[PDB]
């Protein structure tokens, strides 16, 4: 592409051609036109999946949830126009977004009725049916996770950044474990690096050693970050990554901090958190050899709103590791309260 | 960090914040540590046994060429019999085993030309006889903390205090976005693409270095052998899976004597390459046009992959190391006399 960059201290510019990686996190994904492979094709795929034994869909990220929301109406209309007793019901997303073992098939022949595009304006809202194909919601009771399909779409072309472009998707033929690399952008320039996608924005810096600086996550996806989109992949232990490999954290020396290990039991149930290295308001952390061992993550404030003041760690490094969610400060697994017993404090109940 | 960009294929425009990597492959006025510390460093180096300087890149050569007059002015007005003469740069730029020493104190006097002296401190040039490479310094500077930026036009280097073999990371930028990637610095521009697997697409070089590309600035550094990298690691090629192409190995005997190269996977004009099971083995690279101007036309390779590897020198169109003629003997063609 071609682009220009700007300096505001001295008002002027720099232009050229190259690769540009934008901060596309915290932007509304629902202002695009989504084109999954085809209405007839996708209807046949859903029909065959229901006949095989797949009950529903577990969404990889929020973008697929929005896609299914945009598509469900026409999908049900096309299914009804063919005399198939099946309805698609779309729910809500809660974190972390766990994985399913099934995959969505690729039909040989599509259904022989309906229109040949998405966005056919005017169709008769369809009728409810006793058989339901549930996209992920609060429905892990009618069908378990082991019968749900996961990570079954491939992005073919997209225009994210322009709020009325079209997104083209396709049902893949293969079993895969990695995140879709069409929306990943990684860049390093001097002493700063970024690993990013549509939901992650992870920053790094060069102090005495390369280390993590701050992360901003609006979702907790459980795919695998592809190695072709990672800087400094070799010679790194899986036990030292701040963001676990099971949560689509890149396997790199840029995902490390001195004195901390992998945060398996952090507050991943949050809808959105932000990882940063400093103390929380009205708290102090001291390095003490008599402090307790690492365990699940704890919240700085009590369930009654009382702030705990004195914390400790055995061999961590200052500033401490904290997660800033909507509730408030949480602390890393290495930091425990110095005086008050842990039974008076709320803890994370999830593990990656 | 704030800027706008356009995609002319789709004809769409957007703006925002992010990290931008520009193609820079002149506008800089360089500032070493000082005009009074560099002189003391050169004085101590001469009195220590270091007879000259071997450049790392064209950046350093331009710096020395720009600062030589002033450096001689101070070094002569301060009472030292020593003159710095800087020559041109020949490729490839080989390493040296010595390093410049950091002075304890500056020269007391300093802030009109000088006269030629009998003592010569030769910077990179055609003077390999009064100063052999065994007694030359190499990779002895670092760009300072905030010495470089998108909007800088004036780069501030400092004399290094340690021994390193790696290139300066302050001027390196790599990025990947979807199905396109780039590893670049002030002298390289190396591109990659995703067809069925990641592979090298094209590379534009205006200098051949011998430092080492840092692993912190490289994508996909694991599970790769040095025998597969097209641009050899000895020539500051990245230890990356983006530096590979199926059917080819490391090009140790390419035309690295050149002055500005351009790698692309396309046949030279008026030539044909056929994959033949009865073709000669690999060795030094050959040029399509003979020294008399005749163009060779028929070429073969044992198990290479079409399209073939070629180097677009300023004076010709060379082939990869695996591609050989069928009929014409290679004793009469032009070959590369350098190796990595």
């Amino acid at each position: 592409h071609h682009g220009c960059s700007v300096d505001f201290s001295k008002k002027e510019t720099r232009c050229g051609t190259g690769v540009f990686v934008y901060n596309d996190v915290e932007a509304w994904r629902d202002r695009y036109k989504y084109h999954p492979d085809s209405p007839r094709r996708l209807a046949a795929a859903v029909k065959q999946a229901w006949e095989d034994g797949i009950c529903g869909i577990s969404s990889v990220s929020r973008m697929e949830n929005i896609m299914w929301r945009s598509v469900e109406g026409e999908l049900n209309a096309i299914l009804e126009e063919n005399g198939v007793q099946l309805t698609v019901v779309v729910g809500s997303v809660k974190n972390p977004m766990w994985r399913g073992p099934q995959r969505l098939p690729v039909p040989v022949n599509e259904l022989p009725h309906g229109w040949k595009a998405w966005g056919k304006s005017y169709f008769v809202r369809a009728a409810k049916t006793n058989n339901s194909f549930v996209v992920d919601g609060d429905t892990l009771k009618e069908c378990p996770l082991k019968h749900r399909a996961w990570n079954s779409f491939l992005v073919e072309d997209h225009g994210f950044g322009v709020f009325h472009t079209s997104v083209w998707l396709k049902v893949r033929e293969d079993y895969s474990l990695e995140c879709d690399p069409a929306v990943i952008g990684t860049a390093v320039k001097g002493k700063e690096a970024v690993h990013s996608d549509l939901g992650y924005w992870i920053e790094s810096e060069k102090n005495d050693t390369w280390r993590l600086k701050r992360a901003h996550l609006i979702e907790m996806k459980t795919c695998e970050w592809p190695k072709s989109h990672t800087l400094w992949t070799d010679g790194i232990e899986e036990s030292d990554l701040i963001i676990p490999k099971s949560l689509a954290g890149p396997l790199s020396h840029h995902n490390t901090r001195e004195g901390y290990r992998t945060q398996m039991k952090g507050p991943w149930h949050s809808e959105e958190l932000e990882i940063r290295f400093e103390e929380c308001p009205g708290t102090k952390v001291h390095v003490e050899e008599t402090c307790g061992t690492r365990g699940p993550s704890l919240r700085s404030t009590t369930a009654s709103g009382r702030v705990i003041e004195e914390w400790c760690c055995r061999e961590c490094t200052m500033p401490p590791l904290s997660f800033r969610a909507k509730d408030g400060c949480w602390y890393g697994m290495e930091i425990r309260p110095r005086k008050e017993p842990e039974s008076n404090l709320v803890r994370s109940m999830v593990t990656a | 960090h704030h800027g706008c960009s356009v995609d002319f294929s789709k004809k769409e425009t957007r703006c925002g914040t992010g990290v931008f990597v520009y193609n820079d492959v002149d506008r800089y006025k360089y500032h070493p540590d000082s005009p009074r510390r560099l002189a003391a460093a050169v004085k101590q180096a001469w009195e220590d046994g270091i007879c000259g300087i071997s450049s790392v890149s064209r950046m350093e050569n331009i710096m020395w060429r720009s600062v030589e007059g002033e450096l001689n002015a101070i070094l002569e007005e301060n009472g030292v019999q020593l003159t710095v003469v800087v020559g041109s740069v020949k490729n490839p730029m080989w390493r040296g085993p010595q390093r410049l020493p950091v002075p304890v104190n500056e020269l007391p006097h300093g802030w009109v030309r000088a006269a030629k002296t009998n003592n010569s401190f030769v910077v990179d040039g055609d003077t390999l006889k009064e100063c052999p490479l065994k007694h030359r310094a190499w990779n002895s500077f670092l760009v300072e903390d905030h010495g470089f930026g998108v909007f800088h036009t004036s780069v501030w280097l400092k004399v290094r205090e340690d021994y390193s073999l790696e290139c300066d990371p302050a001027v390196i930028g790599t990025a990947v976005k979807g199905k396109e990637a780039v590893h670049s610095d002030l002298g390289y521009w190396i591109e990659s693409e995703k067809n069925d697997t990641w592979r090298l697409k094209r590379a534009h070089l205006i200098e051949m270095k011998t430092c080492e590309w840092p692993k912190s600035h490289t994508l996909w550094t694991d599970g790769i052998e040095e025998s597969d990298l097209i641009i050899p690691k000895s020539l500051a090629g990245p230890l990356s899976h983006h530096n590979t192409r199926e059917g080819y190995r490391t090009q140790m005997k390419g035309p690295w004597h050149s002055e500005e190269l351009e790698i692309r996977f396309e046949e030279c004009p008026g030539t044909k390459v056929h994959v033949e099971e009865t073709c000669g083995t690999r060795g030094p690279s050959l040029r399509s046009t003979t020294a008399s101007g005749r163009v060779i036309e028929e070429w073969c390779c044992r198990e290479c992959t079409m399209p073939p590897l070629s180097f677009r020198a300023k004076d010709g169109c060379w082939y990869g190391m695996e591609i050989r003629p069928r009929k014409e003997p290679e004793s009469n063609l032009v070959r590369s006399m350098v190796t990595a």
Partner: antibody
Amino acid sequence: VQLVESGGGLIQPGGSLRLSCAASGFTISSKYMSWVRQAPGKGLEWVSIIYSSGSTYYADSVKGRFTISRDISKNTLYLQMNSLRAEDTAVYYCASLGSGSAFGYWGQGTLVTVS
Amino acid sequence: DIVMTQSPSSVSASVGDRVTITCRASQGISTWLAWYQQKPGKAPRLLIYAASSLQSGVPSRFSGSGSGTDFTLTISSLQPEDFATYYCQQANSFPFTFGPGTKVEIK
């Protein structure tokens, strides 16, 4: 589909040997292909995997000595073994990850003896 | 480093009988376990994946159930074709690890 193994055999300790697994009916680059060995008189053991994108992982037994490869022009899988020891004698299979994360298609198996 | 254990070590059964085999895990995997059948001199054959699903092409008489740490494999109507060795392997995280194996004999 079909998977056919290749030239395992006799080799002295400290020697090197290279296997192959030719694919038919599908593209080798669209599957997750693994190597599994079974010592004679023992149970199965997983050795190395290569992803559909090219990412490779290994087991701690053969971490620095084996190398799993892949050639798309000839559509076959590869395994380079170096510094073979006495406990490397087994039958080697090539398999594919289908669903769940279980191996669906298996080859016939090829024997390797180190002595 | 996840150790998979099986019980019993060998089962003797008659044709038409009901057979049950169990797997045990060192940690919690809870969905990611698959069952294989190997006759002597031949490659193993996948029967069940995701701890309950039936691989296409195998008879319906094989059933799998369980989660967490305890998993079981059942056979409804034993056949002369069903005398072989059976393995369980966790598919949760690398490295993938199999079980010791349990073999079914004629009684």
